[PDB]
Symmetry: C3
Subunit: 202 residues, 3 copies
């Protein structure tokens, strides 16, 4: 019926209810407050999606035990509707082809219609899936790739329970034994002046 621009004073994260304060002068009082006023939540059965509505947020109140109904507007004496900013959206928060979950232009999960899935942050850290690959991207200079039935890591030092592999692909176990630098002591021979080469390992 009638509505007003409003500021979120406080939120009840259990009741799915907010406390609101008019930001403009109404019609005695001037800045009316509204208590235990509910808002729409997304869910059904045991599942749900929660959005970070918090004190300081702007929106609009509309009007004329234990819950809780997911769509309370029209059937409650009043409800709160967030008026979120979208005008400055880039192709990353809003797309023509992708389903995009995002928070504060900082965290993303995008699902494209062709088999590409991307979970990432603006800092460059990425978990990516394409029709034929899974790739983990470390913006710090590392990349793990599963593709074509092969696995690859390209980046810096690899560490497996102490065992180490350099950025250039040399390895040394936890004990210091290096595959390319190690030597063997040989027993029971005559100190000579010749040099022979051993066989491959046993």
């Amino acid at each position: 019926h009638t509505s007003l621009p409003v500021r979120v004073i406080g939120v009840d994260y259990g009741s799915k209810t907010v406390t609101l304060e008019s930001i403009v002068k109404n019609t005695e009082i001037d800045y009316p407050t509204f208590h235990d006023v509910p808002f729409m939540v997304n869910g059904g059965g045991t599942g749900r999606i929660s959005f970070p509505i918090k004190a300081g947020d702007i929106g609009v109140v509309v009007f004329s035990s234990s819950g809780t109904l997911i769509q309370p507007c029209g059937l409650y004496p009043a409800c709160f509707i967030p008026k979120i900013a979208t005008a400055t959206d880039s192709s990353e928060e809003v797309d023509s082809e992708k389903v995009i979950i995002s928070n504060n232009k900082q965290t993303y999960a995008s699902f494209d219609p062709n088999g590409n899935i991307s979970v990432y942050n603006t800092q460059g850290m990425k978990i990516d899936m394409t029709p034929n690959s899974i790739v983990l991207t470390d913006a710090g200079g590392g990349k793990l790739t599963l593709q074509g039935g092969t696995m690859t890591y390209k980046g810096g030092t690899v560490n497996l329970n102490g065992l180490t592999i350099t950025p250039d692909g040399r390895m040394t176990d936890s004990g210091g034994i290096g595959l390319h630098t190690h030597t063997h002591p040989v027993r029971g021979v005559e100190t000579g002046g010749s040099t022979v080469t051993s066989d491959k390992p046993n």
Copy 2:
């Protein structure tokens, strides 16, 4: 216009329609039933989010070929609205800062406003992304980490196509050859009483 508390008898997962039974006595009949009554779904274009509305669920019916409309309330002669429980929510299902996808307080995907993304279950299994790291957490005693352009695994035995690395960082290929335990047979020498040390590998 008017509404009633209701129980989901059955669901039509194709039509997005439910069969409902009044849980209280109405106003002849007593417990009226409602058929092929629709509900709100989240989606647009090719994308969508499905919630597990199922038989046994509680909600409220409101009233006075092929679909399907995402918001049918107000424009259909009747629609179903789930009345899901939220009063017992912890900071994990509902937050002031995070976008949280969850199911049955068992499965989670949280997106924080600072670059942190967490996909996990209550059992402790975790896939985590921060502004500078990707971490895989095995509640069974293992952790894989990509950070600073380096990759690390700390936990138990690592197995790569038969090749094995112990929890303490010793390795042995599929053939039994251990980097730290292997020996070489040496040919063409005089059995003596001295002992020399070989060079590094070729």
Copy 3:
């Protein structure tokens, strides 16, 4: 109040507004057009979920600066409601137990009520979490598994900064040195006719 079947001519991805064209003849003009007409978006606070509403899409218009309100129906002179297809849904897009995010029957994120999380595409690429495991599935013939405090890869050639491990578990560093094939040159001995075996590495 009154509504019409409609086609999306164009979309304003910044304003959350569409341009619509009636697909049937109205009541002068015949095929009326509607401009800067808004639609419902999912969000609250800094968070949101964007769906790929695009030109060509079908839906229904209902009727009688900078935004933007998440639920504009009933309080705007008109709004757009997508009429998405769901009749052909498989158990993968709609479930009785799982929360499912999907796009175009191509990309999926499913959250089950028992601790199972699945992120995958129809091509078979999978990232899976269960109560006791994390598994990465490469439909090309590879599988990475974290479970029981152990990590395993079974598939083809593993590549770590040049260092290689065959599908059968043999390894060779970037320099060509193979753990099972390498040999050592031995200095200062008498060329003989005997053969001794060295000790383990130093």
